[PDB]
Amino acid sequence: DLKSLAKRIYEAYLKNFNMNKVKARVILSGNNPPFVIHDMETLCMAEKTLVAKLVANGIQNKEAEVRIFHCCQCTSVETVTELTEFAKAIPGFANLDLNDQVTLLKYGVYEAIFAMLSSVMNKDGMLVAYGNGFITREFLKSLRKPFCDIMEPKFDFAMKFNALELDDSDISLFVAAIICCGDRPGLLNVGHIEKMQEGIVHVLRLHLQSNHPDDIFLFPKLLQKMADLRQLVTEHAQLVQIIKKTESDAALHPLLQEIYRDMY
Numbered sequence: 001d002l003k004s005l006a007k008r009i010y011e012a013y014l015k016n017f018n019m020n021k022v023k024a025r026v027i028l029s030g031n032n033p034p035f036v037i038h039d040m041e042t043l044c045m046a047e048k049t050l051v052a053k054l055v056a057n058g059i060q061n062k063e064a065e066v067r068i069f070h071c072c073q074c075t076s077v078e079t080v081t082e083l084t085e086f087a088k089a090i091p092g093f094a095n096l097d098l099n100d101q102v103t104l105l106k107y108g109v110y111e112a113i114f115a116m117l118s119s120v121m122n123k124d125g126m127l128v129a130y131g132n133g134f135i136t137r138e139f140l141k142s143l144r145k146p147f148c149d150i151m152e153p154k155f156d157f158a159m160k161f162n163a164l165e166l167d168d169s170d171i172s173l174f175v176a177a178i179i180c181c182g183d184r185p186g187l188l189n190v191g192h193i194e195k196m197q198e199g200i201v202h203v204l205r206l207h208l209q210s211n212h213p214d215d216i217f218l219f220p221k222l223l224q225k226m227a228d229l230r231q232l233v234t235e236h237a238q239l240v241q242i243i244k245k246t247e248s249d250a251a252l253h254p255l256l257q258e259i260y261r262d263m264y
């Protein structure tokens with residue numbers, strides 16, 4: 001029945017995220033292949049195909065950094081939506097207080113985002129636009145400050161995360177564990193969430209034992225990546241606040257505004 005819990009989480013994962021690791025690595029290996037975005041010329045081409053209403057609105061008059069930022073925001077909104085439904089399908093979660101649900105998701109969504117973002121990254125770039133764009137690490141490094149600092153720390157995390165060779169069945173449990181975290185600020189009923197977390201991590205521990213018998217400390221490694229992600233998000237939010245207050249035209253979508261409000 002612990003395999004029940006694992007298979008349920010995994011199936012809710014396969015069902016709620018449009019992009020999964022199996023699908024992503026196919027696209028990242030080589031009908032409707034991804035348009036490679038590596039300079040301004042290819043960015044403009046890709047935009048004319050994938051966001052024609054925006055181009056018609058004149059977005060290509062804006063700095064490339066602003067369009068990339070708003071592309072990033074749009075993807076974050078979509079993934080928050082998917083993560084919210086995934087969480088809703090985690091055994092015990094929807095039994096939690098409605099206030100604590102919002103708290104767990106508020107603090108957890110970006111840790112889960114950057115964990116799953118590794119699935120669509122390789123050492124040269126990341127998939128965007130539902131698999132129909134591949135924007136290169138170097139083009140993103142090439143942007144003006146502060147925008148060139150957005151993505152490279154996520155690439156750094158992802159290269160070491162992907163070195164662990166986790167599959168979607170591992171990742172789904174990792175993300176569940178990320179979300180069911182008993183030490184978030186603001187939690188009403190911490191004891192239930194800890195009992196929920198304990199149950200998820202126990203399943204994760206058993207699953208890694210079965211699925212990766214060759215990596216002796218993989219479970220402790222993953223706990224450390226959880227700490228690494230929380231520090232990554234803290235730093236990300238500070239760079240995002242710098243851009244919000246400093247960069248005109250880089251306004252914050254309201255769903256994301258509310259996530260960052262009173263976070264760190």
Ligand SMILES: Cc1cccc(Nc2cc(Cl)nc(SCC(=O)O)n2)c1C
Pocket residue numbers: 037043046047050051054059062066067068070071072074128129133135
């Ligand atoms: C890599 C990629 C793929 C598809 C489109 C775009 N450009 C975008 C994407 C989005 Cl969601 N938004 C914008 S500009 C938004 C605005 O200035 O109101 N520009 C980019 C930068």
Ligand SMILES: Cc1cccc(Nc2cc(Cl)nc(SCC(=O)O)n2)c1C
Pocket residue numbers: 069072073075076077079113116117126127128150151154240256
């Ligand atoms: C799944 C995926 C792929 C590519 C980009 C994004 N969203 C990101 C990623 C990164 Cl490293 N940075 C941002 S800045 C805007 C925000 O804080 O949502 N947004 C996401 C969530």
